[PDB]
Amino acid sequence: DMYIERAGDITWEKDAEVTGNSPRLDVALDESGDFSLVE
Amino acid sequence: GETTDGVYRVMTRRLLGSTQVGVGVMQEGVFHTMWHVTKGAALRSGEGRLDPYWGDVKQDLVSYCGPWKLDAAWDGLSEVQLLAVPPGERAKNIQTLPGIFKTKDGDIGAVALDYPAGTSGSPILDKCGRVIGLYGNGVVIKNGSYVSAITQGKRE
Ligand SMILES: Cc1cc(CO)c2cccc(NC(=O)CCC3CCNCC3)c2n1
Numbered sequence: 584d585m586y587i588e589r590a591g592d593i594t595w596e597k598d599a600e601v602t603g604n605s606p607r608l609d610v611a612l613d614e615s616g617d618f619s620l621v622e
Numbered sequence: 623g624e625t626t627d628g629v630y631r632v633m634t635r636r637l638l639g640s641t642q643v644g645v646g647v648m649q650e651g652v653f654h655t656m657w658h659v660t661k662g663a664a665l666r667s668g669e670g671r672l673d674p675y676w677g678d679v680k681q682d683l684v685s686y687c688g689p690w691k692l693d694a695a696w697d698g699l700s701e702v703q704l705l706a707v708p709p710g711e712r713a714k715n716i717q718t719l720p721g722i723f724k725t726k727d728g729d730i731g732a733v734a735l736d737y738p739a740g741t742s743g744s745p746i747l748d749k750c751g752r753v754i755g756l757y758g759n760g761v762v763i764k765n766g767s768y769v770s771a772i773t774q775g776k777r778e
Binding site for chain 2: 589607
């Protein structure tokens with residue numbers, strides 16, 4: 584049996600750590616909701 | 623129980639100790655999370671109960687107590703913030719410029735940030751603090767790193 588606990592506000596934070604690239608990927612989405620790479 | 627707007631951890635006592643299985647967003651009395659986190663099961667909030675209202679395995683989303691309320695979308699141009707809520711760790715905002723998932727039915731925003739599986743359901747936000755989608759459904763790229771879609775529902 585599952586339960587929820589608060590973790591914080593949804594607020595944009597100025598001067599947050601900026602990381603992560605922006606790749607463009609060809610993907611497929613199946614009936615089970617699983618994404619896969621198309622090549 | 624607690625119905626205050628915000629981000630929440632989804633926990634379970636079924637496995638060893640208290641294990642974090644995912645994260646969700648409380649907005650306008652509705653709890654929003656990914657389907658693979660709860661599998662559509664009911665949730666507890668102190669002594670109160672949250673029952674599922676809408677869900678879809680293909681979209682990998684589920685809402686509790688009411689219809690899906692989150693309707694903001696990525697503008698396709700600006701940076702966003704992943705309000706990552708990792709297991710046993712504090713909520714942390716990470717700023718990134720999203721990539722793109724090109725599909726046969728259109729383009730979806732994507733965030734290339736790698737976090738544990740229990741981080742699934744953490745919200746992605748715009749400069750106004752609006753939730754433009756949830757993190758936790760994606761793919762393993764040619765490098766081995768994880769790239770998640772910016773998964774958003776539809777507000778009826
Ligand atoms: C392999 C891996 C690694 C990491 C971390 O490095 C993940 C982090 C968050 C979330 C994941 N799962 C998914 O993206 C799939 C979820 C569901 C499965 C079955 N139903 C349709 C979506 C991670 N999958």
